Amino acid sequence: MPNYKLTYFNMRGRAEIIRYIFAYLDIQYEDHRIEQADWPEIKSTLPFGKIPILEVDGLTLHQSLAIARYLTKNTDLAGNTEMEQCHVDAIVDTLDDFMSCFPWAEKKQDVKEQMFNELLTYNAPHLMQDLDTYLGGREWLIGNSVTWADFYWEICSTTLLVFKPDLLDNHPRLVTLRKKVQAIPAVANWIKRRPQTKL
Amino acid sequence: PNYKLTYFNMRGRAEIIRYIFAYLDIQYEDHRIEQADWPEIKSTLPFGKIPILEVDGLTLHQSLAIARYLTKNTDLAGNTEMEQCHVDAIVDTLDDFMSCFPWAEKKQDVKEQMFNELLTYNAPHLMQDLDTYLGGREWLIGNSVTWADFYWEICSTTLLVFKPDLLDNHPRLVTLRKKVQAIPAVANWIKRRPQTKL
Ligand SMILES: CC(C)(O)[C@H]1CC[C@H](NC(=O)c2cnc3nc(C4CC4)ccc3c2)CC1
Ligand SMILES: CC(C)(O)[C@H]1CC[C@H](NC(=O)c2cnc3nc(C4CC4)ccc3c2)CC1
Ligand SMILES: N[C@@H](CCC(=O)N[C@@H](CS)C(=O)NCC(=O)O)C(=O)O
Ligand SMILES: N[C@@H](CCC(=O)N[C@@H](CS)C(=O)NCC(=O)O)C(=O)O
């Protein structure tokens, strides 16, 4: 048994993909959440001043997608062929690119509001349409079994729906995919048992 | 397999793939398009972006997903799962930074302001972080070159076009660039590639 400690804020955010992977693989870990009050303290110690980080047997890892890739290496979640592993990474990166456009840390309310609106109004539907086309009539995004891209799709879409509840109105196949992920017992169990935060 | 890489006539996000092909001695069609070609091609792509890599007629996208696919089971990947994690983290740290720049911005006033903002405040912190993380080592991860070293040299090249003094107080990061550039396969590609701003 290896010693895992996850450090992030109290919210889903960029740590959530790691938490889904831990739940799905049934791995016990310390889900260390922090208030903003403690943020400047810990920040000074961090290698690149960013969370989430994951401590593994006294060794520190950073970058949430780098960590998620490390944890799924050698598992069913990574993909069934070398090429399918690329597709998993590329779908994840495509989703992460779009989530990263949003100005999460913007101090000016009016600039943050205008940007969140532009992205959700013009960009988001282009992405939903491309994703819908990519999925087609298949059960999972890549190959014939669930991957951590399906986890990421579910996590990303959950946060987009908070700001734009009608996002998937004309995309029932993408809603089905969210339901299929949420129905995975280990994921269901995590969703039910997790702190209820907005983001 | 036969490889066809499609991107704009610039280093940009394709350059990491081009360094990996050079290093591994892999022949490939380096297909470069002008802006005028772009709308025609954009609709054929499942996610409407480039670069794309065609491997025996099958399309891959996302530059870093492709880089990770090409380097798997090679000396560029990182020797252990943990070191692979470090390689991914460094590349993601660098790529996060390069993504902040408003590459596609029309208004040159707000564009120059943000470029200078990022190069003034944010770039030196990242330089200091990288210099610390590198410590006593000659390469970013382990005891040999990885594609993270390539990516450093690629990202730093583009940053030095806008802020040539960025590595004045960081000679070990300069050394790292020169070590990447002294690799024969890389040196050879750098001498022969089309000379572009970006
Ligand atoms: C300390 C502070 C006030 O400066 C910080 C606190 C944390 C904030 N982060 C977010 O609000 C946030 C939330 N969800 C995200 N989800 C994603 C995608 C779905 C995985 C990506 C980035 C996200 C960023 C930024 C400001
Ligand atoms: C269609 C269009 C005309 O609107 C496009 C054309 C391509 C443009 N992209 C860039 O100029 C560009 C260039 N170098 C880059 N280098 C990086 C560094 C390596 C990681 C990241 C992003 C970059 C983006 C955006 C607008
Ligand atoms: N690409 C990185 C992004 C890390 C990141 O920027 N995280 C934010 C929280 S969502 C943070 O730590 N912000 C601190 C700051 O910039 O002051 C990842 O996915 O881990
Ligand atoms: N994270 C992606 C980004 C791809 C991307 O944004 N590419 C730009 C060119 S640098 C593009 O195709 N832009 C087309 C457009 O915005 O219309 C990658 O690394 O491949």
UniProtKB/Swiss-Prot annotation, chain B:
PROSITE patterns documented for this protein: GST_CTER, GST_NTER
Cofactor entry: glutathione
GO biological process, one term: glutathione metabolic process
Main location as per UniProt: cytoplasm
Protein activity control: Prostaglandin PGD2 synthesis is stimulated by calcium and magnesium ions. One calcium or magnesium ion is bound between the subunits of the homodimer. The interactions with the protein are for the most part mediated via water molecules. Magnesium increases the affinity for glutathione, while calcium has no effect on the affinity for glutathione.
Alphabetized InterPro entries for the sequence: Glutathione-S-Trfase_C-like, Glutathione-S-Trfase_C_sf, Glutathione_S-Trfase_N, GST_C, GST_superfamily, Thioredoxin-like_sf
Top-level division of the source organism's lineage: Eukaryota
CC per GO annotation: cytoplasm; cytosol; intracellular membrane-bounded organelle; nucleoplasm
Induction: By 12-O-tetradecanoylphorbol-13-acetate (TPA).
This enzyme's EC code(s): 5.3.99.2, 2.5.1.18
Cofactor binding annotation: Glutathione is required for the prostaglandin D synthase activity.
Tissue: Expressed in a number of megakaryocytic cell lines but not in platelets. Highly expressed in adipose tissue, macrophages and placenta. Also expressed at lower levels in lung, heart, lymph nodes, appendix, bone marrow and fetal liver.
Subcellular location: Cytoplasm
Function: Bifunctional enzyme which catalyzes both the conversion of PGH2 to PGD2, a prostaglandin involved in smooth muscle contraction/relaxation and a potent inhibitor of platelet aggregation, and the conjugation of glutathione with a wide range of aryl halides and organic isothiocyanates. Also exhibits low glutathione-peroxidase activity towards cumene hydroperoxide.
PANTHER family assigned: GLUTATHIONE S-TRANSFERASE (PTHR11571), HEMATOPOIETIC PROSTAGLANDIN D SYNTHASE (PTHR11571:SF224)
Family of this protein: Belongs to the GST superfamily. Sigma family.
Protein name: Hematopoietic prostaglandin D synthase
Organism: Homo sapiens
Taxonomy of the source species: Eukaryota, Metazoa, Chordata, Craniata, Vertebrata
